[PDB]
Symmetry: C3
Subunit: 495 residues, 3 copies
């Protein structure tokens, strides 16, 4: 079901049993996954978030991030607690009001307070484009062509465990899927197609942790979008999708009418598809309603490799075509030891005053911002290159940057850089020990933008810092509403 | 489950997944459908409604209607919000204390606040008859023979629609069914029978909108009751049942021990029975526990027609064996334009003071009453006749009158009136353009009686007017308890 | 999932549908059953119970008992409402803080307010012994090898009438099972085993009422533990387990790879296994994922007889070898009349002031303690014998004593006493008219200890007395935290 772009979104607690095991959840709009929030390019989004949360086992405060949306001019609507706002307290509401100029594709929203999105607050977010360059490549693009991949846990997020060393208890495709241990025969999701039709499947990883090896028996997948970035057509028979990433692929339903297994194997937890775990069903209209009996290819032949991807626009790459050919050029020491993650020797722990507020309240630099050693300023209007060399356990770590997308100049498991036509995206696997995954972008977006591993467990163990982009232009660039001013006083009073 | 006639009924929010899709709901008695409320003819019903609702997305006020109960002398207990009461606000309770003289059969209860009953607050209501004139036509008449047909939506009622055609997402029979799009193989309701026994099936439409074509593969159905009214035995192989109607039929379990599909095909929403949508299972004790493999008749051969129904008692018709032959005969103009329905040029919008309250406060005439043009007065001890010509989009509209049942002198799709032995009921389909459905009853029940289309979407869009019957005797006829008197000040103060 | 020995435990309302019928529940830790609370022998348990209950229909107060934990020194933490504490009110927490010296084995926890544990608040409690003498008898002992058996009702406990014979609507094994009437094909629990491994299976009855005949097609069970007491190895092929009892049994997975039914026939409610009621699935790794087609042995040849159990340690028996061979020997007259149970002519009805507070406020004798005639004082360091002659309306009644385990000197259906080597346990069936089931313990545990039938409906109808053990020393032995003292003032104020 789709909303808005002008919509109420209630946040409530409910018990759900997607794999047959009832446990409490945090829900956005009352469903798991949450409803699809949607509009067109350049629509004004006004999302009135009513916090009705009562079950403190999962926190009764909340804060919501719109994942992949630049929020230029509206950094205050971005969502990461203590980076851009204080949480909303229960009984209160907050209008997240923002535009999406110049963006279209497949995104998602989620809780961005501690590990709460694991406990259920996550759903798809799609910016349709009436003049979408890829539109003529399929027949159907609607709510029935969104595929969500979710890790699901029998253990309350607040009670793990971290880090960790945390594993899921099932994979849910479109909110349904079977339990890894003592698999009960619970309902599986169905995705229906009609012969001769072509489908823009919008694959959204709403994972708190694992990446999935995603494949559809008997069928190929032509990638056309990645993390909201339109791509040159690339046909693959399997896609490894890391936490928070999105792909749009054309499914051409050109196989005999019948039932085929939809497959999503995660890097951790249950291995295989016994009992129908890690599965959903692709069904042709007119097929017998039964489980598929198909098998995967013995060896997948055109597996997705990130260096095979290039933008549909001529995006090029900002800066100079050599290792470090950028203005401000960073290289981060990403580490782990004693149950905590570090970036440049510092584990992230949220400040009492949201970075955005510190800035709004007079901070000029840089050295003025809390937490010390967890904020890096970026000069206005500048090529930034970030190297994120791998090694820290574990891994592989999908890094994400708020308020931007970035050219992926060097991907995982391949030391050959690309300064011509690399894919731009917003979340990237930093690969394995030895790798030197590197990104470039331009600072056209004043404000504090979170940079973190997107494995939520590791974010909670402090794998993060803040790019405080153009500090001095941060207040003129982001006027805040009164209601945002009211957040931190309400929250501090409440706690 | 059965209660009362004396009972508590708590109204709460819960998420439920009747077709495998979790969403929020508004439940009476904590279950979907609500528990069966039951007692004997003549019983005093005492039903303490506790409002414990908190999810504002479906409204936290409520008001409950006991559909088909005449409510003589207890007009204040009727339930339609702003006609007979202000809603009960959350944290409060209200005793609906009323009696059922001279009524016995199959009824239901529902929220009668906005479209709240679509969100879950619907349940069967049954008045048993220790001397039921049909008791010897069956062996078993209990909670396991009640069959509810319900439309079910993935979109919250307050976010429809509207109007705006609106369509359901699954059919639920006894609270379970499978979704119309990307149907997941979720559990289906089973009804059990034993060879040689006869069952009073109490078929209840708790629908917000669609009518159903109901059938059981391999079985005939002998109708013995219509909307509370005992009928002569009419055997049919299909029953088209409109929103809010009820039928008791005898099922004779005379077939070979096995599994038989129960079928209920809505007039809008998913068509057919693929993957077991629009279906439940009739099982003989001793059958292999397996899905049925039966098929419906190619052509139904004794489909129910309303003119073939006749009261079991000689009821006759009030007034004159010709058209317009009543003390006080009305012909309503029923229209639709600009997303609203109108009755005699006026679209119903709820008053601020409930109609019963304005009467109790001095009001004397329809001119005196709010809403303006939305009230028609009726003189006491008269034969009313109401012609309800069809044609308004989008039929067919099931029109319902509170506080009464009526003789249907002219039915759908047939211009031949019947002033002899027409069936009496309380909810009648007005058919299609050209039809002139007409009803007669007698004014022996002072108070404000709602008259509306029972498609809830159409009622919220204005398809109603109020018959204020015997205004002058209303106050003395219906003494009100203090708790009713408190409802409006409490409600007004809350809002 | 496992939590503890130090943990939060939130008590919330949630609708659940374990047999496909949605209804309201009172949940501990958000699941049904509750999470397993675990620790090692000698550990300090600190369970913070957050009462977040809102649904009045099942009571918003609550109070938890740790069934079979002796609570020596901590009688205030025991949990029975109005015996050792007042209920925690909604919105408050309370810290159950206690140790388990000397004890190991399989226990459980539940609401001990009114009939609330029926409504969901139940879960297993395991004390692991790192030097368990039974360790070498098996390979696998963990959360996957706990098996709960639970009766489940469609009727909310508070509405059960009462008593009034009462019957469940399904049997749930590990929280899943099928309804007895109009059985829907809803998911069944699976217990997975690997060819050639031995399992410590922890069978726990969390029943409100029925006793189960428990068995596993094709397999033996070697009993090694009974209600916490290590036992000599006893191979049986069926186990009658009465409400609140526990057994650990070794299952040798020695049959061919396949699916085998696990059976739990309740002594009332649905009879047999038609459609998979009273059923769960034993699945071997490698078996096809399908319903077992196994059959129970026609006659079970080595079913559990309680007189066959002997302690593993040399517990022997206190006192002297003949009836009355104790310091303080009691014979309780157990009756039922007009819907209430009596113990020595008195029917238990909860006092306004909790028994332990009565003592703490300076009561010195049973005569001084309310309710009048519902208290029997015991002297310290004395051998107690309690005869519990059956005959009272159904029956068979499982009696349980708080703060103690006890030698079962005489078992049901067998009039021979055993004063050498009988099993010790904490819940015991008193059998049938004519029986004289007899227990013995020593009084080394100052405090008021509940003795009641563990059929909860029978407890609410009054089948209980309090053993006020060493009243003089009770206050000194049981120092209370301010929080406990805060309980009654809150409760009484709220009500
Ligand atoms: C049209 O409605 C009329 C009005 O009731 C129905 O008329 C009855 O039909 C049967 C046919 O023998 C007769 O027994 C009666 O004489 C008719 N009743 C009266 C009161 O005249 C007729 O059934 C309907 N037509 C159709 C085609 O269903
Ligand atoms: C439907 O039937 C009603 C009868 O109650 C008709 O009523 C009258 O019909 C005469 C025509 O002979 C006209 O004077 C009016 O149009 C009607 N008014 C009254 C008060 O009788 C009505 O005409 C019929 N209408 C339709 C739409 O079929
Ligand atoms: C069961 O056992 C008890 C004793 O353990 C029996 O109680 C005896 O009862 C008789 C008559 O009631 C008294 O004279 C004795 O004093 C009791 N003996 C003792 C030692 O107290 C009781 O009768 C038995 N009940 C049965 C068999 O129903
Ligand atoms: C009834 O109870 C008695 C008491 O335990 C059981 O008698 C024991 O029987 C075993 C072997 O049959 C002997 O080793 C013991 O000497 C008996 N013990 C005592 C203490 O007498 C008896 O077996 C039980 N009856 C049944 C049918 O099981
Ligand atoms: C990664 O590449 C960067 C280029 O900016 C280089 O400075 C650094 O030494 C490299 N580290 C590793 C581990 O390759
Ligand atoms: Cu994100
Ligand atoms: Cu983001
Ligand atoms: Cu990481
Ligand atoms: Cu983030
Ligand atoms: Cu109605
Ligand atoms: Cu009505
Ligand atoms: Cu209508
Ligand atoms: Cu109405
Ligand atoms: Cu207990
Ligand atoms: Cu106990
Ligand atoms: Cu009992
Ligand atoms: Cu107890």
């Amino acid at each position: 079901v789709q909303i808005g772009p002008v919509t109420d979104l209630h946040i409530v607690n409910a018990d759900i049993v997607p794999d047959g095991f009832v446990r409490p959840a945090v829900n956005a709009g009352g469903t798991f996954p949450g409803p699809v929030i949607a509009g067109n390019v350049g629509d004004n989004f006004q999302i009135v978030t009513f916090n009705q949360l009562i079950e403190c086992s999962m926190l009764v405060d909340t804060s919501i991030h719109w994942h992949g949306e630049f929020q230029k001019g509206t950094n205050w609507a971005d969502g990461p607690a203590f980076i851009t706002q204080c949480p909303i307290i229960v009984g209160n509401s907050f209008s997240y009001n923002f535009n999406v100029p110049g963006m279209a594709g497949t995104y998602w929203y989620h809780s961005h307070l501690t590990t709460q999105y694991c406990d259920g607050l996550r759903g798809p977010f799609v910016v349709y484009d009436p003049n979408d360059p890829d539109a003529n490549l399929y027949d159907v693009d609607d709510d029935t062509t969104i595929i969500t991949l979710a890790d699901w846990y029998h253990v309350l997020a607040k009670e793990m465990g971290a880090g960790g060393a945390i594993t899921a208890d099932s994979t849910l495709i479109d909110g349904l899927g079977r339990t890894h241990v003592n698999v009960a025969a619970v309902p599986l999701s169905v995705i229906t197609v009609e012969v001769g039709k072509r489908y823009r499947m919008r694959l959204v990883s709403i994972s708190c942790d694992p990446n999935y090896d995603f494949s559809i028996d008997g069928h190929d997948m032509t990638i056309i979008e990645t993390d909201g970035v339109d791509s040159q057509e690339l046909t693959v028979d399997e896609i490894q999708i890391f936490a928070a990433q999105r792909y749009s692929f054309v499914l051409n339903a050109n196989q005999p009418v019948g039932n085929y297994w939809i497959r999503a194997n995660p890097n951790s937890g249950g291995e295989g598809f016994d009992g129908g775990i890690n599965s959903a069903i692709l069904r042709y209209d007119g097929a017998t309603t039964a489980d598929p009996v198909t098998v995967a290819s013995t060896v997948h032949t055109k597996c997705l490799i990130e260096t095979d991807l290039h933008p549909l626009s001529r995006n090029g790459v900002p800066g100079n075509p050599h290792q470090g050919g950028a203005d401000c050029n960073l290289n981060l020491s990403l580490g782990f030891a004693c149950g905590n993650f570090v970036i440049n020797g510092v584990s992230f722990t949220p400040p009492t005053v949201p970075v955005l507020l510190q800035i709004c309240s007079g901070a000029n630099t840089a050295a003025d911002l809390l937490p010390s050693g967890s904020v890096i300023s970026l000069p206005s209007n500048s090529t930034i290159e970030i190297a994120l060399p791998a090694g820290a356990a574990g891994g592989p770590h999908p890094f994400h940057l708020h308020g931007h997308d970035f050219a992926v100049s060097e991907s995982a498991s391949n030391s050959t850089s690309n300064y011509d036509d690399p894919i731009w995206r917003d979340v990237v696997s930093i690969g394995g020990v030895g790798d030197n995954v590197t990104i470039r972008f331009c600072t056209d977006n004043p404000g504090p933008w979170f940079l973190h591993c997107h494995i939520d467990w590791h974010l909670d163990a402090g794998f993060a810092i803040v790019f405080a982009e153009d500090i001095p232009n941060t207040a003129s660039a982001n006027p805040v509403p009164e209601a945002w001013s009211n957040l931190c006083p309400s929250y501090d009073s409440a706690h």
